[PDB]
Design a protein around this ligand. Sequence first.
Ligand code: HEM
Ligand code: HEM
Ligand code: HEM
Ligand code: HEM
Ligand SMILES: c1ccc2c(-c3ccc4c(c3)nnn4CN3CCNC3)c[nH]c2c1
Ligand SMILES: c1ccc2c(-c3ccc4c(c3)nnn4CN3CCNC3)c[nH]c2c1
Ligand SMILES: c1ccc2c(-c3ccc4c(c3)nnn4CN3CCNC3)c[nH]c2c1
Ligand SMILES: c1ccc2c(-c3ccc4c(c3)nnn4CN3CCNC3)c[nH]c2c1
Ligand SMILES: C[C@](N)(Cc1c[nH]c2ccccc12)C(=O)O
Ligand SMILES: C[C@](N)(Cc1c[nH]c2ccccc12)C(=O)O
Ligand SMILES: C[C@](N)(Cc1c[nH]c2ccccc12)C(=O)O
Ligand SMILES: C[C@](N)(Cc1c[nH]c2ccccc12)C(=O)O
Lengths: 331, 343, 345, 345
Amino acid sequence: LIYGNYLHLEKVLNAQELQSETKGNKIHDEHLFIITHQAYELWFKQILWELDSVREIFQNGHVRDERNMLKVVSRMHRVSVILKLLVQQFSILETMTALDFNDFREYLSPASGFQSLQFRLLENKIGVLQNMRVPYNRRYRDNFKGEENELLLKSEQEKTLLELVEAWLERTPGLEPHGFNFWGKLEKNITRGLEEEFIEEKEEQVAEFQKQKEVLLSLFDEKRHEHLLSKGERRLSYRALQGALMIYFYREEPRFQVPFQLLTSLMDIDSLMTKWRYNHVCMVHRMLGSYHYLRSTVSDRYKVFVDLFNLSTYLIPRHWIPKMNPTIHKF
Amino acid sequence: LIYGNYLHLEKVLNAQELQSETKGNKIHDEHLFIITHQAYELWFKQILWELDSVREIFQNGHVRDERNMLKVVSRMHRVSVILKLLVQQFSILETMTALDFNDFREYLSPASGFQSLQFRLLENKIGVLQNMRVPYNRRHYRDNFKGEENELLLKSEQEKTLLELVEAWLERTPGLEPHGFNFWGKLEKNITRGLEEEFIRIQAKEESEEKEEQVAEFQKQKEVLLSLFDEKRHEHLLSKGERRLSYRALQGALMIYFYREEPRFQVPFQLLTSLMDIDSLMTKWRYNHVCMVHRMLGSSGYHYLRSTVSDRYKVFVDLFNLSTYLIPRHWIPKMNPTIHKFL
Amino acid sequence: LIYGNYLHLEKVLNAQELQSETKGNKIHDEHLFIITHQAYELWFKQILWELDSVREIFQNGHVRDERNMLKVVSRMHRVSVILKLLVQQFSILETMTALDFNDFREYLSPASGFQSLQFRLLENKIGVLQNMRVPYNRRHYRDNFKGEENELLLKSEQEKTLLELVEAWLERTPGLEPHGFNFWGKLEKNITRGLEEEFIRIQAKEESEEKEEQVAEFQKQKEVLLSLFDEKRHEHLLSKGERRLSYRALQGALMIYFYREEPRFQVPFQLLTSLMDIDSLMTKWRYNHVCMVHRMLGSSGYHYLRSTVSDRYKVFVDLFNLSTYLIPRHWIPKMNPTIHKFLEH
Amino acid sequence: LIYGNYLHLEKVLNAQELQSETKGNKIHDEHLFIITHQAYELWFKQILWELDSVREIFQNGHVRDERNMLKVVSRMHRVSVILKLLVQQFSILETMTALDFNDFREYLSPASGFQSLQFRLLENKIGVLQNMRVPYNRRHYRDNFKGEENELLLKSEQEKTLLELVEAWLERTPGLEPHGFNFWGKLEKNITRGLEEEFIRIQAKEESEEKEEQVAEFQKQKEVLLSLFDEKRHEHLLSKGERRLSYRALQGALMIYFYREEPRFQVPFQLLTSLMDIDSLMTKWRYNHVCMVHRMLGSSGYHYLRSTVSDRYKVFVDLFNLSTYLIPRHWIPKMNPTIHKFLEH
Ligand code: HEM
Ligand code: HEM
Ligand code: HEM
Ligand code: HEM
Ligand SMILES: c1ccc2c(-c3ccc4c(c3)nnn4CN3CCNC3)c[nH]c2c1
Ligand SMILES: c1ccc2c(-c3ccc4c(c3)nnn4CN3CCNC3)c[nH]c2c1
Ligand SMILES: c1ccc2c(-c3ccc4c(c3)nnn4CN3CCNC3)c[nH]c2c1
Ligand SMILES: c1ccc2c(-c3ccc4c(c3)nnn4CN3CCNC3)c[nH]c2c1
Ligand SMILES: C[C@](N)(Cc1c[nH]c2ccccc12)C(=O)O
Ligand SMILES: C[C@](N)(Cc1c[nH]c2ccccc12)C(=O)O
Ligand SMILES: C[C@](N)(Cc1c[nH]c2ccccc12)C(=O)O
Ligand SMILES: C[C@](N)(Cc1c[nH]c2ccccc12)C(=O)O
């Protein structure tokens, strides 16, 4: 076995066709354009590789065996690491001036980054929903045809990471009312602590406190949630949300240490996915002038685990957090 | 034209074949290994693209037209930027544990990164010389390569390297002409003078430990500084391969260093800086590679590799070492108005 | 002389006071919070150092001596490099969980990064204009600052900004002189001509939707391209604050863009590129800051900040927008050998 | 409470004294030099903050409560993140040319980065051993430091290092107990067996160059694999300082490596990974430092430093070298339900 043959470089390193050259006027910087995109696509494939694997672990119920949690967090962190690189990779294309890109931009028409099948498959597999997806020029799948359109559909219809994480989050231990009844203990301890606290600048604080109280108690409005879920402003089942907050509050508890890491990485992937979009935009600006559709992609509308980010709003004094009783200290 | 078809993704995204899977026992992390290498190879191709272009500009004498200097420095900086990324790219493969790599390392033998044609072409096109190449397994590197590959690899060694081409251009650097600004002459004189002047300074110091310190500092500096004009020392070191640039080229480089602010020398200096950046980064690549192979294979290619992280692989080491011959600014020959115009 | 004494580490490394600890309940992650900010502030000081130096080079007219161009681009690139780092530095504070920050956030009230004198000095010295600055809680920013601080902050606003100084220099860009190369005239002509020539091409074409599409494209392009020569449109946009550069400065910048390979314009172009890099990175800083305040406080300042990530805080947005007015290379006015002389140093 | 006052910026931003300026000939790039170092020092303080905290968790036996494992790995990862940045931070100082540094290097003598108390404290607290410290021009390291400096430096040397503390904890790693899972025994057996089994396979083959190659490989592997059970070889190497961990600690580490997916070993493995990352990064720091001092001073400290980039400075080299003793997975002693149940929480 030789490197070149192991890596099918006969394919990889014979995939560069400068359209400028194909049309008689070869432009040098076009090479970079091609390579950059090809590298992105390689890495997308790797992310899909990792993601699909993680999805499978959830779907096949392997995640139930908490031995598989190391594997899950490892592969999720790996995604975040690839993404961190893909963000830095824009620095490479920033070496191309707009003036120089202009010299071949025409031979690209009518092509677009939009037509990255993998990027869409990625958005889909994480949990970006078309219902909340910004339409571009009153139009995404329309541009894709064939097996591509077919796969794109499977991607939308098969379980997303969000869905699968939701499922698992719903089964998070300690939610059982017959058990630790976290939610009940929480509502009580908060209401109590609230009242205790509720017993000039005073007025200002009072006003602030009423605002805080509303938010804090908003947590227990199952209906508010269902509504927001419908409007798509939240994404996680109320039960899943409970499991997540369980994990947040009892993270140091051994059974919840890696699960918390997952949540952290899930948020990191959202953060990075959006950083990708941002860097892409800042460039398309520097390259095409005036952008706005893309500036719209950086809107938290594409944050799939936005629920995890927003659990920061509902932070309470440590004192108020239900205690780890002997029984659960065992469990 | 569709993106997928423009980018020949039919090829790119149909090039991943897990040998573990080909042999029945698919290992997940093997995918990463493949992709990582494929990305490296893509980027190598791009670097070769840039480098070959720069070489051509030098060889076809376009570099004489100083309008092409922007293009040259841009493309050279771009190389350094790709390399910066290729160094960071190791962070990705560091996500793979040794334990997990072990689960497929077998299905790789007898393949190695050594068989990267592009990496070799790259080493060669910059200016790595086979004479000063550390032997692998008591043998040459091209021994591992056969066919058109071996053929190309030779062309790469024999065709003009960036070093050679930069040397040529450095030799033509204005200001060296003795009939002109006579930089080298003025320099030798101004250094001789400065040294003497400083000696008197130290002589003035009543004998003390302080004076002693200065004395030692002085003598070492003097030796080094005058070493610069020992054209024979140079020729010797050139032979031993410890330097690489013609003495004339070395003069042009120091010209550029000292008169960098001069408009004609501003971008030329940037080039020199980038040339050094490429060496620095190429070495950082090697270092990160080694640091990983250690984490992955334990402890020995490791030792062979630890050997490749040396000035033997640094092509523009001469540019780095011009830092040793740094002098007080007031010693630097003053740009004569006439030649001040020439620059 | 000792390292520690050279670097006044007696000060630097005795400047960490955890308020949590000062109040009896020391929280560990507070140390990180302090250090991170202190490092940012060190780097801000360095950027101000570089910026002020470059401003002075422009103000004192040293920039006229094109020897100083290397120094200028070097120091400007250095800023962009510091900024690149400052953006990555958020990764450090991302190690702090919101849960853990919550354990000391209280001992901070009412303090805020908003009270970063240096950040404001920086925004100001580059060219952020108060009129373009989104007010927070219906209030100005300097209103939070008092004393010599307010005095400095004012000097920053009143002294020449980099924008102003670059504008001045851009206006003196060679090639614009009508008596000389008359770039703008030649350009208007060459563009008007080219457009006509292209219109004919399209009109020659065999009736199709593709033709219609090209027709549409053509009108759009034509409008934009000719918009360039509407000095009144410019003055209007300047008023609306969509542009920031004088029309003449804009001419000089496009001169440099189009004739960058010309020796005299090689480093000047690099400067333009760096100026844009600084804006890009400054905005990336703001973005990462926001993305974190979200991760930390949830969803409001957050929205104020989300507002700061706009081209309204981009000082050299005009340089970014010169990409809109890109023309076929063959349309660019030709450099006379004789003319190449004023661009050959 | 004001930002500036919280952060004692009266100190931090009044700690820049350009010696060039103090001596009449201010050099611009000296500012950068100062700031860069000051930032490094801030971050070192933070690393020491994190490290000391982790050391205390180990020393005070809090690590026994496996709730505190999350905290430990988090803080150790944070160190690695700071270090990643400190490595990138050299990019900033690379903006300074040697030519320009030369213009002030004189006013620095006789100061040096060597005199970073914090860096030494850091090296010491991790586990760099004074024995294996390469002498600089036949000089010690501590010799340069006097007073409280020397005092603290010693405490750092004498107090428990991270290595020592990790060793302690590694020795208490569950599964090693002979009356329990007897990992070591089961391992030796399973390895001896596997090797024999493989030898037979090769013996069954027909004499050939391939066979010889395999045979040679097999003997090499066998030696290494069985070397693992030579407690005395270890003790010797420990003496020569080629290894650092007790043989029992080494057993615990390999336990963790092999049974990492086991819940009780998942975070512990992460720690090991981060410990190795800290070595890797600490050494990357040294490398980048050297690469620069060369670019700045030419080629000597350079060579002394090139010496610091060795496994002689790698504290957790034992963790790196556990990669040598990797065996087929099927050879690894199996976690029987009963004992698996012991390793859960
Ligand atoms: C010169 C560089 C680039 C330009 C001018 C550019 C231009 C654009 C434009 C204009 C769009 C909006 C759709 C349209 O009107 O066609 C877009 C979207 C996109 N581009 Fe790029 N692009 C560039 C580089 C890249 C790179 C390096 C990638 C890497 C794969 C990429 C991937 C994408 C993706 C995935 C989208 C869809 C955005 C979304 O809906 O999330 N582009 N690009
Ligand atoms: C698990 C990861 C890796 C391992 C264990 C590994 C191992 C090795 C080893 C042992 C060598 C020395 C030659 C030999 O004994 O076969 C080597 C050389 C090489 N590897 Fe890697 N490698 C790894 C990753 C990579 C990657 C990601 C690249 C990217 C292209 C790469 C490129 C090279 C090159 C170009 C050489 C020749 C270097 C020289 O001779 O100067 N390796 N590798
Ligand atoms: C946990 C981390 C952080 C949080 C929660 C945070 C929060 C905030 C908030 C809420 C504001 C808006 C003003 C206000 O309502 O008080 C703000 C502005 C600011 N922060 Fe931070 N910040 C964080 C980290 C940092 C860091 C590392 C810096 C570095 C100096 C910084 C510098 C600033 C600056 C300069 C502003 C004013 C920016 C502008 O108004 O355009 N902050 N921050
Ligand atoms: C122009 C830049 C620099 C130069 C020329 C320089 C020079 C040197 C030299 C020559 C040494 C070897 C000992 C000696 O001769 O005194 C050294 C060691 C050291 N430098 Fe630097 N240095 C630079 C930047 C830095 C930076 C940015 C740091 C950050 C903290 C630093 C920290 C140190 C430390 C801690 C050592 C001791 C390392 C060891 O012995 O293990 N230096 N430096
Ligand atoms: C391969 C080929 C092209 C791309 C682009 C891309 C997308 C849109 C572009 C463009 C380049 N140059 N001009 N435009 C304008 N659009 C507007 C609608 N159609 C043209 C990004 N990645 C690519 C990979
Ligand atoms: C593709 C395939 C393999 C590689 C390697 C590589 C090199 C040497 C390796 C290895 C992988 N796994 N074990 N070894 C040990 N050496 C020791 C002597 N010869 C085998 C790097 N890049 C690759 C790309
Ligand atoms: C030093 C001290 C504080 C900060 C902050 C910062 C900013 C706003 C904060 C905060 C910390 N904790 N709570 N808030 C709420 N805001 C909302 C309206 N004003 C208070 C950032 N950097 C700092 C440096
Ligand atoms: C603060 C102050 C100084 C330093 C240095 C440093 C290290 C070595 C130096 C130096 C500066 N200037 N010259 N040398 C070398 N020798 C050669 C002969 N006499 C001086 C690094 N970091 C610092 C922080
Ligand atoms: C057995 C279980 N792992 C239960 C579970 C769900 N979410 C969790 C989060 C943390 C810890 C445990 C869980 C499962 O059913 O997957
Ligand atoms: C005309 C010339 N470019 C001469 C030359 C050589 N090196 C230089 C450095 C800076 C400026 C000019 C030169 C050539 O012959 O290429
Ligand atoms: C002589 C000049 N430096 C003219 C000038 C202004 N901007 C430029 C850009 C590129 C080249 C020259 C200029 C001055 O007046 O400063
Ligand atoms: C009770 C214990 N925490 C046991 C222990 C030691 N090393 C470990 C590694 C992984 C898991 C557990 C351990 C202690 O004695 O510290």
